[PDB]
Design a protein around this ligand. Structure first.
Ligand SMILES: [Mg+2]
Ligand SMILES: [Mg+2]
Ligand SMILES: [Mg+2]
Ligand SMILES: [Mg+2]
Ligand SMILES: [Mg+2]
Ligand SMILES: [Mg+2]
Ligand SMILES: [Mg+2]
Ligand SMILES: [Mg+2]
Ligand SMILES: [Mg+2]
Ligand SMILES: [Mg+2]
Ligand SMILES: [Mg+2]
Lengths: 345, 199, 190, 138
RNA sequence: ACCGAACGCCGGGUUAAGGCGCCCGAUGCCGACGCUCAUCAGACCCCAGAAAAGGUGUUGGUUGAUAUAGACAGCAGGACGGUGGCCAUGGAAGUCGGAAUCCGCUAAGGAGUGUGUAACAACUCACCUGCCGAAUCAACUAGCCCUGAAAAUGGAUGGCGCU
RNA sequence: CGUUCAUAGCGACGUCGCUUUUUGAUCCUUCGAUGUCGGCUCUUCCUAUCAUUGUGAAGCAGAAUUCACCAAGCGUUGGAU
RNA sequence: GCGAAGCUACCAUCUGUGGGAUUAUGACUGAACGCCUCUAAGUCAGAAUCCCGCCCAGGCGGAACGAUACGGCAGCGCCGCGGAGCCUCGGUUGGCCUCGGAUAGCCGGUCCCCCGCGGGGUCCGGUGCGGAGUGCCCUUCGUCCUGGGAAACGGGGCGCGGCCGGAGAGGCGGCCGCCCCCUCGCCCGUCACGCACGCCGUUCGUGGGGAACCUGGCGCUAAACCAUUCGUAGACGACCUGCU
């Protein structure tokens, strides 16, 4: 027979390969589209989730009951040190897809970027890029690399840039820096590649990528929770107390003739550690790190034009399970995906 | 030893039967430019046919079930696979022999390609009937790369126009050379036309 | 059955120059050029007389569904000659009960803004077809004039602003509001 | 855009059938896909023959649509379609195809040696034209 | 359980019933004549699906007319008078309805086809002229196709497909 | 029937069809066993569409409400017995 | 009682998207049916439908890049070219390219014009069951000796250096300067090649693809896993880390 009382589905059918994430760093699946009218710029950045706090601000939309009032807001601090550009990569449009064409790394690659190429930095002999760095101070090697740049300028349609984080200025335990392709969207391919060549072996701060009061996207891996039950996983109804084999289970899977258990039937398994992209998070403030002109400047982080104190965004005793933020940061309205010390795009 | 067939203007099943038979007869066939394949019956008929094919899917695990390929080359591969005995070793060898391409790749753009008049639209359909392009069908089902293939085909049509201009220049040199030499190959040209050449 | 021959002639006046590349006819004269590609129509288009005085259209061995196309090719040729020589002018009046419909052209006649239809706040922007000029005429209260050469483009542009001003979820037999086509003529009469 | 019409007096070439490769005067039209056919000096009898197995040429001759073989024989001999057909380029390449089919192996060897020497001489002339055009464009 | 055909082990040949685009052996005939467009096409006894009714969609047939005495649709003058005739009173000067059911002007209005009235009034259809000048109209009937025609896992002319 | 008006909505006297979501009818599978009703939980599917999107018709002036189409995407509740 | 950390609650908080084809429907032009008509050819608008963009997983699917075993024995990759010997097989000249229409098309100079030597348009001329033909074209497939005629300054040493072009899945081709040698393509006179005495897998793409020994020059020096630690992770595996 049919179902007596109609009910919506527990769980989403779009999010159900619920496997543990094969990647740890939040990967961009879709960069914004480019048009040759705006100047060249980065479209993504990579920072680490520090913590959470309040924000008291002035509400300025008409028509609401909360017009010209004060609210509190749950925000995320994301410590975003300026990254280092150590390479570029070109892409060509094929009828089978969007294929990479040529990857040109930089001459002087830092040891934090070199840690990524090794699974064991201790037992390694640190021999990466040793015959590739010799292709810069000679005439024939620089000529072949310039011919490769010219071939990329002629044939490539999509240009991404290779940038890695700085693990020296962070309170985390690890030293292996995260590398990332960031698609440069802007003018023509020649001016784009010339700007990327200019920004090679350089620092990219946050203000060159994002600005004030911008609605951005957060990409990251969920805080892992382990092999959870179907009640904790799919939020199904608990069976009553009088059950014999269990009350935190799914009672009926399905019918006899085929409704053998499908992708749509809720089961127990992995909860958490899932790749997630959540859109429309507002940047309240892009902070400024600790800089020295005579002594330390701790004021410019958390002192507003209404507070006029000498506070930084570091709490009393620092951030819980993260460390102490000494670098420039961003502060996003809402909550972002991932636990503390989590890499976040 | 390899046929290079053009998919321009050729009917889907009419071409697929001939390709299936010639590949089962032990011959390497490369069917190319398969978004130019046209199917008899108009676009709403062919679109609802392929949408019904999309609706046919396995209920319990659609990743286990029918694989619905959107690209026109893989649609042609599917309609030859439905004619080949693909559950057998000779059918799998025939599927290994057949190579199908969207657009036309640089391994095959500089090759003379063949035309099958037994599977062609001008020969087989009445001119008052309707048809539908497999490229438009695939693009409005969900195949992504009609425009990239269009720009690449525009580039190679410019390159082939340059090559055909050079071929016309070589051919006018050949004709003016025959005009210069036809006084000294007088008994070389005559012994071809007494046996059936150049007339 | 298959009728052995259906022929029809179009005598063009001396102010018109027509030619054809296969089934692709082009008609130029005073007001401009108009092209029409009669491929996939599958007829014979001969062009005879000294200085091409007439356009003759043939259908050979066609049954009723293709015998019904000779006169529509002839009618498109008449409409194209009329658009080249005299042009097409469609007059269309704004009929309203209470709210006066405010119509304003923006670039020349390309974008047309319609306001205050049934007292609504949503403005109605309509892009016209390329080649159709919209205007608000003189000595008449609320009336639009669409000028052009292609009868297809002018009448489609009239149908767009006629279907933009429709009454939703009411009795349209009572609410007789909108911009409706009242006159179909030419630019010059001659 | 048509030039060849099925007219009383049209001379056609039979593509296939019993009288394949022969000329035909169309005397009358019977149906959409069947004609009335005479062959007075081409050894074809008066019969009906469909339009599928005949390829109409650009020769016309004058006789009324129900001629009793004599006036169409006189019109054939007056217009002299035999010598004009022998002078026609398409029948010349038809008999060239016939000579190619009747090519013997010794004849094919002589043709192959003539191909070889003629292609060598014309290829040397093409190379001289290429270097002369390079010197002219220089 | 249907059609063909009954059986020792083989070689050559020939067929029955079925078929000859590919699976799958064979039409890779330069096959003949027509019909069919399907936004649910159709595809071979049993047999695995369809009805009544309808279609100027298209192809034929049957019957009856008119067209130089100047058709058919297309712009255009009219439905008056005996007559508020006659039962209907609760209202029929055409008018909810029914027995009735013709003359005059005549070029022409049927004691009327509708719009619509406590009743009216008014708008408005047989026939012809001014304009275009030769095939047209009406009713049945048989083919193919369409509507009728809606089920539950994704679904089957066997599949691919086929115009 | 509907102030006139068969067909906006209905529709007698008759007649043609679909469904196995009801009961019948048969006994074809199962009696060396296929656990026999409801309720709870949970998933998928059909449209013969209640509401929502887009529309056409009303005896649709507006509001409200009926008839019909494309259409199963998303919903179809808390309880006393 | 209160309660750190961690989990947790629409019991707290944050976020949740745009196009394309179009259905029904309304239309445009306009026949059939010299009138009219959304339809017959064509064209427009069109939505919780469908499909994709967003998001999730990433193919017995690819791509770019880095490093590639100096040790107390070793071992690899590019180049020029020599040797048998095992395994697995397919083969038996190649074609090195216009787009395009089917009620049309191919080729010229362009006297005429426009645009960036080339392209395009007008006129004219040659074929069109295609001879500027896949019914097609290209290479000969016996050898060498010497001694004439027609034609030719051509070819070669995986010829050395330079100019380039080719990215969709490139992996090849053209053009110049220089050293040496030869009489190769078509006809003829001149003989000789184990002429194996009729008998079948001849010929070759091929210095075919994989493995084991050997001739040299140049270039080189590791990475992964286990053990330890971490907890952004976790049933175990697996994942993120740190350690001259
Ligand atoms: Mg239900
Ligand atoms: Mg119990
Ligand atoms: Mg209403
Ligand atoms: Mg019998
Ligand atoms: Mg049991
Ligand atoms: Mg059981
Ligand atoms: Mg329905
Ligand atoms: Mg209860
Ligand atoms: Mg749209
Ligand atoms: Mg429509
Ligand atoms: Mg549209």
């Amino acid at each position: 027979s049919h179902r007596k009382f109609s009910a919506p589905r527990h769980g989403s059918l779009g999010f159900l390969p619920r496997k543990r994430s094969s990647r740890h760093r939040g990967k961009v699946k879709s960069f914004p589209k480019d048009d040759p009218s705006k100047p060249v710029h980065l479209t993504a950045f990579l920072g680490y989730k520090a913590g959470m706090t309040h924000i008291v601000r002035e509400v300025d939309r008409p028509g609401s009951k909360v017009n010209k009032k004060e609210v509190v807001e749950a925000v995320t601090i994301v410590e975003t040190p300026p990254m280092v550009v150590v390479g570029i990569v070109g892409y060509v449009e094929t009828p089978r897809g969007l294929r990479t064409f040529k990857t040109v790394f930089a001459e002087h690659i830092s040891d934090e970027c070199k840690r990524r190429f090794y699974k064991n930095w201790h037992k390694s002999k640190k021999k990466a890029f040793t015959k590739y760095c010799k292709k810069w101070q000679d005439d024939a090697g620089k000529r072949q690399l310039d011919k490769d740049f010219s071939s990329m300028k002629k044939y490539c349609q999509v240009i991404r840039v290779l940038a890695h984080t700085q693990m020296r200025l962070l309170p985390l335990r690890q030293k292996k820096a995260h590398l990332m392709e960031i698609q440069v969207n802007g003018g023509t391919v020649a001016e784009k590649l010339d700007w990327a060549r200019e920004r090679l072996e350089q620092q990219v701060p946050v203000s060159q990528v994002f600005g004030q009061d911008e609605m951005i996207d957060v990409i990251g891996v969920t805080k892992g929770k382990g092999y959870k039950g179907v009640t904790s996983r799919w939020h199904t109804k608990k069976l009553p107390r009088k059950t014999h084999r269990g009350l935190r289970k799914v009672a009926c899977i399905g019918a006899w003739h085929p409704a053998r258990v499908a992708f749509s039937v809720a089961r127990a398994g992995q909860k958490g550690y899932h790749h997630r992209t959540e859109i429309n998070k507002k940047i309240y403030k892009i902070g400024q790190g600790y800089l020295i002109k005579d002594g330390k400047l701790i004021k410019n982080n958390a002192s507003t034009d209404y507070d006029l104190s000498d506070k930084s965004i570091n709490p009393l005793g620092g951030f819980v399970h993260y460390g102490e933020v000494t670098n420039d940061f961003v502060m996003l309205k809402g909550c972002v995906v991932g636990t503390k010390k989590r890499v976040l795009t | 030893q390899v046929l290079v067939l053009d998919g321009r203007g050729h009917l889907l099943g009419r071409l697929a039967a001939i390709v299936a038979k010639q590949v089962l007869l032990g011959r390497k066939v490369v069917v190319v430019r398969c978004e130019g394949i046209n199917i008899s019956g108009n676009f709403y008929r062919n679109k609802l046919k392929y949408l019904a094919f999309l609706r046919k899917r396995m209920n319990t695990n659609p990743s286990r079930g029918p694989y619905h390929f959107r690209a026109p080359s893989r649609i042609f591969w599917r309609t030859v696979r439905g004619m080949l005995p693909h559950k057998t070793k000779r059918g799998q060898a025939a599927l290994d022999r057949l190579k199908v391409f969207d657009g036309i790749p640089p391994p095959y753009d500089k090759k003379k390609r063949m035309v099958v008049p037994a599977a062609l639209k001008v020969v087989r359909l009445k001119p008052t009937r309707k048809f539908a392009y497999l490229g438009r069908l695939a693009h409005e089902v969900g195949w992504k790369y009609q425009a990239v293939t269009a720009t690449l085909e525009e580039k190679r049509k410019e390159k082939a126009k340059i090559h055909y201009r050079k071929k016309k220049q070589l051919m006018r040199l050949r004709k003016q050379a025959e005009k210069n030499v036809e006084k000294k190959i007088d008994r070389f040209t005559e012994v071809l036309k007494t046996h059936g050449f150049l007339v | 059955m298959k009728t052995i021959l259906s022929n029809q002639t179009v005598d063009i006046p001396e102010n018109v120059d027509i030619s054809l590349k296969g089934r692709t006819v082009i008609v130029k004269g005073p007001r401009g050029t108009l092209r029409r590609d009669f491929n996939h129509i599958n007829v014979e288009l001969s062009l005879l007389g000294k200085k091409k005085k007439r356009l003759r259209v043939d259908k050979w061995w066609g049954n009723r569904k293709e015998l019904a196309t000779v006169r529509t090719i002839c009618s498109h040729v008449q409409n194209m000659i009329k658009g080249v020589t005299l042009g097409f002018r469609y007059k269309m009046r704004s009929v309203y009960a209470h709210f006066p419909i405010n119509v304003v052209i923006q670039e020349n006649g390309s974008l047309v803004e319609i306001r205050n239809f049934l007292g609504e706040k949503y403005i109605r922007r309509v892009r016209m077809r390329p080649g159709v000029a919209c205007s608000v005429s003189q000595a008449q209260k609320d009336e639009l004039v669409l000028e052009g050469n292609d009868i297809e483009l002018v009448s489609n542009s009239a149908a767009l602003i006629q279907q933009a001003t429709t009454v939703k979820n009411k009795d349209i037999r009572k609410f007789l509001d909108g911009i409706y086509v009242s006159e179909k003529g030419t630019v010059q009469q001659a | 855009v048509f030039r060849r019409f099925v007219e009383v007096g049209r001379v056609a070439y039979v593509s296939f059938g019993p009288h394949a490769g022969k000329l035909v005067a169309i005397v009358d039209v019977i149906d959409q896909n069947r004609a009335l056919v005479d062959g007075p000096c081409t050894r074809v009898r008066r019969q009906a023959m469909p339009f599928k197995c005949m390829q109409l040429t650009d020769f016309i001759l004058k006789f009324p649509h129900s001629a009793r073989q004599k006036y169409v024989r006189k019109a054939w001999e007056k217009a002299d379609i035999n010598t004009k057909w022998a002078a026609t380029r398409w029948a010349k390449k038809i008999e060239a195809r016939e000579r190619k089919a009747k090519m013997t192996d010794f004849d094919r060897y002589k043709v192959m040696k003539a191909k070889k020497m003629r292609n060598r001489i014309i290829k040397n002339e093409v190379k001289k034209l290429q270097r002369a055009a390079l010197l002219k464009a220089s």
